[PDB]
Structure formats: C-alpha cells, structure tokens
Design a protein around this ligand. Structure first.
Ligand SMILES: *[C@@H]1O[C@H](CO)[C@@H](O[C@@H]2O[C@H](CO)[C@@H](O[C@@H]3O[C@H](CO)[C@@H](O)[C@H](O)[C@@H]3O)[C@H](O)[C@H]2NC(C)=O)[C@H](O)[C@H]1NC(C)=O
Ligand SMILES: *[C@@H]1O[C@H](CO)[C@@H](O)[C@H](O)[C@H]1NC(C)=O
Ligand SMILES: *[C@@H]1O[C@H](CO)[C@@H](O)[C@H](O)[C@H]1NC(C)=O
Lengths: 48, 466
C-alpha cells in the first residue's frame, strides 16, 4: 500500500501543518517506495 | 438526518445544513477540508462527504447515521480511502454537534484533533440547532436571583492549576466545553482530565442548574460522566465562595477523591448585591468630613475620545432603560449595536488619595477584557472579511482562533492567533478639585488595552476645606 506523488504531500501538511515538514534514507523511500504509518510520518514534521 | 433523545423524545433537525455545496473545515495554514452534512460534498468524489486538498483523498462516505450521545449529535463518515498505518485500515470522520445557545460566527465545523493510529478525524460543530433545553444558569437566593452567565467561557475553557504550558484540567460551567486545538476533549464534555500518558477522559458533563446551600450560603454545581471509574461512573463537583475583588476567579482543584473531583471557585459573582454604607458619599478619618457626590448622580454623561463614545454615571447606570445595552454597567463603551460594560455599578468603591488630595471612585467586574495576538499586538474590532464585519476572534480558513490587527483584513492581510485574557474590565474616576466648575465634566485620562479606563472629573464638590 504505497503513498506516492501529491497524495504524500497533501498528507504531510495534514499532519505537520504550521510546524512544517522535511523530506530528510528519505521519506519518499519510507512511505512511497514502501509502506509506513502516520507515526513514521510525523517523525518528519519540523520541530515545534 | 434526524435523531431523538430516548429520555425526552426531543426532535433534532439538522436539515438546514444539507447543502450539497457544503462547508469548508479548516486545518493547518491554508488547508481545506471540503465537507458536507447528511449528503455528499460536490468538491469530493461522488458518495464522499469529506475530502482533502489538491488530491481528493476521502475521509469518509456520506450517510444519515445520526446518534444521540450524551447531549451530542454524532455523525459518522465511514469507509474512506485506505490510510498508511496497516493493511485494511481506511480513513473515517466523526462529526459531532454540540449545544451552543449563543449564536454567532464561530458556528462552523472545526477540526479539534486527530488520532493517528485508528485513522479517525474528530470534528466539532457548535450550533443552537443541537440544543434541547434552555441555558439554566441562575438560582434564587431569597428574593434576589443570582446568575453565573458571565462566567461562561465562550472561546475555549478554564485551565486548571498544576496541583502537584502543561495543563491538567479544562472547565466550562453551564454550556459544554468549547473546542480547543490539538486537545481532543470529547465533544460535549464540561470537565476534562488530561493525563501525561493517555488521551483526555470525560470526568464532567453538565447535569442541572446550580444548587444552593442553606447554611453558610455556598453554591454547588454538579458534573457527572459517560465513562466508568476504576472502582465501579465518574463525577465532578464545583463549590463556590464569595471573594470580592478585581479578579473574577478561576476554578482551582482542592480534593482528588478516587472516583470524585472537588473544584473550589472563589468569585465575586457568588456574592450578593451589597447596598452602599452612606449612599453616595466619602468618609475617611484623615479629614473626618464627607464629600457629597449625590449632586453628580443626576443623569448620564457622554465622554468621547477617538470615536469611542463612553457613558459615565456616578452612582447611576451608564445607559438607562431606553438603550440598556450595558446592564449593571456603571461605565459603558457604546457602539450603538453591542456595548461593553467597564464595571458593575454595584461594585462601586470610594477611597481617598492622600498624594493628590483626590477622591477615587471605581467599578469592577464588567465584561471580559479584549483579546490579543500571541506576539502582543491587540486585535481590532470590527474588521471586514470577504464582505462581512466581525466582532470577536473567528475561525475561517484557519486552525486556532484568529483576529485582525487592522480595520480590514481583505485590504491588508494582517493577523495573528488570539490569546484571551482571564481578567474582566475595570473603570475608575479620580475626582479633582476646581472652584469655578459648579457642575463639571469628566474627561478620558487613560485607556489601557481596553481592559481599564480612568476618567478625570473636575468638580466643585470635591474641595471645601474653607
Ligand atoms: C447630598 O446632595 C443631595 C442632592 O443635592 C441631597 O439630596 C437632595 O436633597 C434635596 C433637598 O433640598 C432634594 O431636593 C428636593 O427635591 C424635591 C423634589 O423631589 C423638591 O420638591 C424640593 O423642593 C427639594 O428641592 C433633592 O431631591 C435630593 N437629591 C436628589 C436628587 O434626590 C442630599 O441630602 C445630600 N447629602 C446629605 C448631606 O444628606
Ligand atoms: C444570600 O443572601 C444573603 C442575604 O442575607 C447573604 O447574606 C448571602 O451572602 C447570600 N448568599 C449567596 C452567597 O448567594
Ligand atoms: C453511568 O450510569 C448511567 C446510569 O446511572 C448510565 O446511563 C451511563 O451509561 C453510565 N456511564 C457509563 C459507564 O457509560
């Protein structure tokens, strides 16, 4: 169950929001090349 | 699209929101949740009631499944697009409808919080459409009726003291708790417990109107539960005292009984209307004689500075029975449409300044002081937005409650997040001597944040040692 393209980008700001997010392996490798959870997604949210 | 309370048989109609065009819930900074109620949204794919931004990522299919859950009307959008987490798991949204008798702009679907694991979106919508009973908030102490209506938090809630910023409890003492950000206190809850490890738990839901103690004249207010204790239903009780002063008080915790919760609130609203000692006069033993301010108690005055048209009445209500915008208010900041009190006439105090040889009159406990942004720049009311004028912090296309810092947002796009003050408006009049001013006129001396206004009144009355 892959999470690629703009469908990864829209999900990033849904979790991170005003905190912001990065892309640094990388997040595209962890969630698009494979499958991740939303916890392995909020690890890429920029520090509040 | 219709739910009934099994106990009362009260009909709930939410069909006034069944627009297929729907409404836009706000997340992040420019995030858009195109959503609808009872029907499918138009921006989202067919069948989908709510979705995401550039891509049409569903967070649940549209249905009529409406539930009554402890004063709340829940709507469940199930079977959306698959979510990351694990195999088989899809997105879902629980859109709740909480009772709110006070109509206004904040009557929109907000995103309170989200659970990552279960892929469930918590939604809260506060409308008078979801209200069964009235706003029972007043009790009778003899012939005079005591009300708790000013103490209603209408933007969020009261943060509780760290008994033994990181909070512990959230409290709302008549209407259900208002939806905050990132803190998922179950919609409809009155008292909320937030532990360090674990989600918020419902330790309070509004039961009935306040009860009265016959002996030492205390007022109590009960808040039951919908979730069980660790020895059986939870419960929370709030006790009230009479503490006269500038502060309106805040619900503090005193006893943590294993299945109960005791909150002690010291507030001047749980005090009777005390009739003044010597009518409308001043007496200090330093001079020993009295100043008769009853000569000024004749009528209304209109002191104005920078568009702000105040109304001052020494020993008399600011605005009379005609306009009557600011009830109890001794000073009232007029707008012609709203009005805001700067101190209840009943709370009047007279003191003698020995430095300037002046007489100080002060009212207290008016309206809630104006909100500011987190940076420190005060908000500006009223402001235009898309073609509408606004009176308080709103929530359009933004997560937390925001205001404008200009007269117009559409024109200047200047804004910040609101942080509300837990203090109420005060007003004072420093009477200064002048011999030729038989019946003088007060003037604005100092306006501080709109949270305090001091007037300088020059009269003949506050003089004679001749
Ligand atoms: C402090 O000042 C006030 C106001 O001057 C004193 O009360 C006032 O006493 C006078 C007595 O001359 C009242 O005037 C009377 O009014 C009636 C109409 O109701 C009229 O028929 C009489 O001819 C007379 O003029 C006045 O109404 C009253 N104040 C008000 C406005 O109600 C007060 O006595 C003084 N404080 C002390 C030392 O007690
Ligand atoms: C109720 O009224 C009496 C009047 O004697 C007063 O003493 C008491 O403080 C009042 N109780 C409260 C706090 O409501
Ligand atoms: C608490 O008890 C009442 C009946 O007294 C019940 O209706 C309610 O569901 C209970 N709360 C829980 C544990 O769900």
């Amino acid at each position: 169950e892959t999470l690629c393209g703009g469908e990864l980008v829209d999900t990033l700001q849904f979790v991170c929001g005003d905190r912001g997010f990065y892309f640094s392996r990388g997040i595209v490798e962890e969630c698009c090349f494979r499958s991740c959870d939303l916890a392995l997604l909020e690890t890429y949210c920029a520090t509040p | 699209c219709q739910v009934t309370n099994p106990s009362t048989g009260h009909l709930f109609d939410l069909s006034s929101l069944s627009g297929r065009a729907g409404f836009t819930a706000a997340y992040s900074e420019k995030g858009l949740v195109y959503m609808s109620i009872c029907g499918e949204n138009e921006n989202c794919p067919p069948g989908v009631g709510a979705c995401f931004g550039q891509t049409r990522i569903s967070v649940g299919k549209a249905n009529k499944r409406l539930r009554y859950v402890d004063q709340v009307l829940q709507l469940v959008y199930k079977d959306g697009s698959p979510c990351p987490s694990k195999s088989g798991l899809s997105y879902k949204s629980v859109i709740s409808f909480v009772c709110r008798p006070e109509a206004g702009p904040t009557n929109r679907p907000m995103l309170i919080s989200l659970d990552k694991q279960t892929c469930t979106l918590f939604f809260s919508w506060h409308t008078p459409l979801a209200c069964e009973q009235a706003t029972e908030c007043s009790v009778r102490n003899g012939s005079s009726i005591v009300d708790l209506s000013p103490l209603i938090h209408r933007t969020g809630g009261y943060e509780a003291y760290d008994e033994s910023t990181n909070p512990d409890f959230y409290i709302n003492i008549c209407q259900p708790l208002n939806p905050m950000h990132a803190v998922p206190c179950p919609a409809g809850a009155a008292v909320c417990k937030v532990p360090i490890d674990g989600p918020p738990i419902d330790i309070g839901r509004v039961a009935g109107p306040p009860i009265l103690n016959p002996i030492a004249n205390e007022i109590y207010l009960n808040f039951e539960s919908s979730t069980p204790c660790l020895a059986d239903n939870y419960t929370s009780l709030i006790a009230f005292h009479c503490k006269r002063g500038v502060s309106m008080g805040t619900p503090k915790l005193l006893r943590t009984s294993e299945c109960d919760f005791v909150f002690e609130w010291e507030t001047p609203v749980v005090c009777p209307d005390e009739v003044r000692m010597d009518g409308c006069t001043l007496t200090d033993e330093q001079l020993l004689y009295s100043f008769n301010l009853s000569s000024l108690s004749t009528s209304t005055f209109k002191v104005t500075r920078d568009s702000r048209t105040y109304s001052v009445g020494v020993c008399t209500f600011a605005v009379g029975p005609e306009q009557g915008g600011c009830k109890d208010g001794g000073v009232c900041l007029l707008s012609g449409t709203k009005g805001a009190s700067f101190g209840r006439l009943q709370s009047m105090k007279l003191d003698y300044r020995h430095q300037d040889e002046a007489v100080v009159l002060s009212y207290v406990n008016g309206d809630r002081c104006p909100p500011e942004t987190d940076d420190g720049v005060p908000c500006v009311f009223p402001f235009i937005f898309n073609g509408k004028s606004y009176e308080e912090c709103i929530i359009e296309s933004r997560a937390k409650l925001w205001c404008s810092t200009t007269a117009d947002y559409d024109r200047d796009h200047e804004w910040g997040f609101c942080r509300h003050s837990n203090s109420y408006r005060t007003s004072s009049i420093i009477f200064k001597c002048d011999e030729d001013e038989d019946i003088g006129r007060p003037q604005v001396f100092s306006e501080v944040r709109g949270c305090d206004v001091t007037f300088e009144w020059k009269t003949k009355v506050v003089c004679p040692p001749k």
